[PDB]
Design a protein around this ligand. Sequence first.
Ligand code: DGT
Ligand code: DGT
Ligand code: DTP
Ligand code: DTP
Ligand code: MG
Ligand code: MG
Ligand code: MG
Ligand code: MG
Lengths: 434, 434
Amino acid sequence: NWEHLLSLKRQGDTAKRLRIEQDDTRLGFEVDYDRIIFSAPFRSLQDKTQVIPLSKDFVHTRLTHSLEVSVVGRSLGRMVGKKLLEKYPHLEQVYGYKFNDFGAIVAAAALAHDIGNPPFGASGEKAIGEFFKNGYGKRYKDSLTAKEYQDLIKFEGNANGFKVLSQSKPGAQGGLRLSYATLGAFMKYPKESLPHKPSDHIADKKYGFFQSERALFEDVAQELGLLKRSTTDDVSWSRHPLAYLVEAADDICYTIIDFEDGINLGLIPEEYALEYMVKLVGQTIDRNKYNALQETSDRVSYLRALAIGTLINESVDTFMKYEEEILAGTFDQSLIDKSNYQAQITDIINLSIERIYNSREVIEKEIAGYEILSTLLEARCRALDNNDTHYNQLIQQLLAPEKSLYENLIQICAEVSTMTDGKALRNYKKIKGL
Amino acid sequence: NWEHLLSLKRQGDTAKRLRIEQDDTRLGFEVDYDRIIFSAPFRSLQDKTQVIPLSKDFVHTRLTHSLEVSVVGRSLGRMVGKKLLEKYPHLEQVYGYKFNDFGAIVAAAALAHDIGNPPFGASGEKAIGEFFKNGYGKRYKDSLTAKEYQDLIKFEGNANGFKVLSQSKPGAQGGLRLSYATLGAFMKYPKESLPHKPSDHIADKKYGFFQSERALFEDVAQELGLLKRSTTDDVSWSRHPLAYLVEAADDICYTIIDFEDGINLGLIPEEYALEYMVKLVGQTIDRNKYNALQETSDRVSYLRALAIGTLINESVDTFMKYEEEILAGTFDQSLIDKSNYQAQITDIINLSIERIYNSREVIEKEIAGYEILSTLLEARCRALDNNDTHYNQLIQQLLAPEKSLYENLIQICAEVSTMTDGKALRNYKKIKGL
Ligand SMILES: Nc1nc2c(ncn2[C@H]2C[C@H](O)[C@@H](COP(=O)(O)OP(=O)(O)OP(=O)(O)O)O2)c(=O)[nH]1
Ligand SMILES: Nc1nc2c(ncn2[C@H]2C[C@H](O)[C@@H](COP(=O)(O)OP(=O)(O)OP(=O)(O)O)O2)c(=O)[nH]1
Ligand SMILES: Nc1ncnc2c1ncn2[C@H]1C[C@H](O)[C@@H](COP(=O)(O)OP(=O)(O)OP(=O)(O)O)O1
Ligand SMILES: Nc1ncnc2c1ncn2[C@H]1C[C@H](O)[C@@H](COP(=O)(O)OP(=O)(O)OP(=O)(O)O)O1
Ligand SMILES: [Mg+2]
Ligand SMILES: [Mg+2]
Ligand SMILES: [Mg+2]
Ligand SMILES: [Mg+2]
């Protein structure tokens, strides 16, 4: 039920924090927002790849993408919360909740939803995985549990993001110490790395936490009241209802903005821009304003602003139509896939894949990223092995100012993923002496 | 005794050169000085690392360090020689020696005391060793004698310096053909590479000659009358008395100048400069002059000039107090370790280690040096193996305008150590085509 889903608990708490005992100027979710804003992991997003590597231009990075997702998520959360308190009046009438709380939760979750991504993006994650699969790290296969090896060979940015958010350090336990509602709404694949893709459900495409933090998530999963889907030997719970909204906001934003940026770069003609969006923007377009503009940028910006407004309302309608199934855990798709504009979205995505992801420029950067990440990971792993050599001591002093082998390897992968693109490239040249 | 220690013999001589038959304008030790000054190995010291690699700035290189050590050694030798001829009048009264001869010997020995060091310094030597230990060169372990392999895996700059000084070439035997007193005073570890650190004595921390020149040193060791410390299967003699003075001069100079340069660079505050040297400079400091100066450079230069003058006199006193033990071979430490200022010296050294050697700047350069040296050594060794390939012929023509395997490997290591830092880096890029 909804009372346990909006928990204000933080790690290490003993008492019970109640909504009616909060300070209304600064609620806990706003504190979460402010704690994410002021941290270094959030700042490192400014020079991390969204689509085009090493482009910190007029193209998007992870930071600006996260900000746009935050705005869209705040809007979605406010509408859905107003409709929910309309449906269940006891929430507001007894517990003391307002529709701004839902917006704060979704905004905070959407702000930190990519905070664990490594440099170079998808190619970076695949390179980290291939290093342990077919490279040097393969030699560790026999020393590790099967699920730990699966963690290392299918490295996921979501698990690393959870690790960053809930990291324990000497003298400061809990990390950022976010609320449990925010951690639940941030969590989109509540399962371990094995088994690999059991079903066709949407919460099974990947995994969301490592083996070193499973216990932590267990605590979270038992406070919110999430339904359990497996207890044999591998735990898996159902989604928090607001993770659907977070995912919808992320999908809308990147789907539209990638097209707009590709048009502005010179890779997609504007005829496609009008053709694939006339249906989306037809219900609110004022042709006069469209015909007055004299630049491609103004036209594409107008079209994007209209399309986002249409899609947000459609998503809210879908969520309120399937609320019961979502709360019961039986809803196996995304809110976007149940929309009237699926064909247009698929056409835009296919055009983006053909014209942007496979561009020469984009390709060369990913190959360079593969080389850089492999070099840095091999250096760290060889330093971890010997430990007695002078060279090993130098590498330790440069790249790292009692734990198990799995903990050491996962820490190595986490430290590689903190770097930006430029810092990784600079370290690569310094290692090579170039 | 002292008559045989000041020998004027050169390699290949048949007759006996006597001191009273010399030309007083140009004695043999001055000829040694002039022969070292005009050679190419001495010139290559201008772009070789002392502390900070690739800094040929206002920081020291090996050449300027060697010049300062030469000045301090000349002073020490003159004082000790005057006191010795005071103690033993028969030297001057019969053989015809003057106290300038001791200064000439110590100056010539201190001028060439680092002439065998490779590029990048201590990290360079360790890289050359690690190449044979854990790298490609390990494959030769089974083809070599144990002492030869120990030579190759504990590569020493002192042995390479002896090799440079006493190198035989077609048409010119003996190399620079220095006097035997100078060669003895240059020699600080008269032993082979095995056994490794037998005792806690000071002449056992390392080794001083390779297996290809052992015979040569034997000749020297039998002309001076050095005492023998082992004859089972590994030869080891005692130190020439003036090697103590050479080592004292080297220690004083680098200990003070490293601190001064670190202060001038911006890595050590000046408060430490006054705190750790007030005791050293207290007996001769004129506060008026110190308070008149208005720059950090002038103050640190004043303090250094006072400290060197104090330490020189203390070292002379220690040498004359323990002369009998030194001549008997029973003196197991250095003249610096028997001084009243050991605590201040240790504090300055520890500060230098924490603040200069482990700086980021310093660290990155050493890692690059490791990469460069490993690449060049592997290329030379692979050229030495196959010999029939076209690529091998090209590498031979580029890097080298009937001998055993050990001779070939030691010649490879000697040719790598002739390069400066810049030349090694340029060759590395040319090999990589960058
Ligand atoms: N350059 C390049 N970019 C790609 C590729 N695949 C995806 N992208 C970029 C374009 C999208 O704007 C961006 C979205 O990345 P996400 O990790 O957020 O993807 P997704 O929504 O599938 O999220 P997920 O990790 O599955 O929850 O990734 C690719 O193969 N190459
Ligand atoms: N960058 C760097 N410099 C070092 C390190 N260790 C020593 N040095 C530098 C600082 C000293 O001024 C300089 C002295 O080198 P030497 O080879 O003359 O040393 P030492 O007096 O121990 O002579 P030795 O070869 O044992 O007779 O070496 C190190 O780990 N890193
Ligand atoms: N409903 C919404 N909620 C949140 N963000 C939105 C919404 N609609 C659009 N956005 C995003 C994308 C737009 O470029 C940007 C500004 O929105 P907005 O000013 O309402 O758009 P617009 O230019 O279509 O205005 P209008 O509807 O007044 O003509 O915010
Ligand atoms: N006794 C010495 N013998 C040889 N070199 C020395 C001696 N003392 C110092 N040095 C070195 C380091 C000094 O910076 C440099 C010049 O010495 P010097 O001019 O005597 O020093 P100073 O500035 O202390 O002079 P003074 O004693 O006249 O005040 O030579
Ligand atoms: Mg995102
Ligand atoms: Mg609008
Ligand atoms: Mg020296
Ligand atoms: Mg003086």
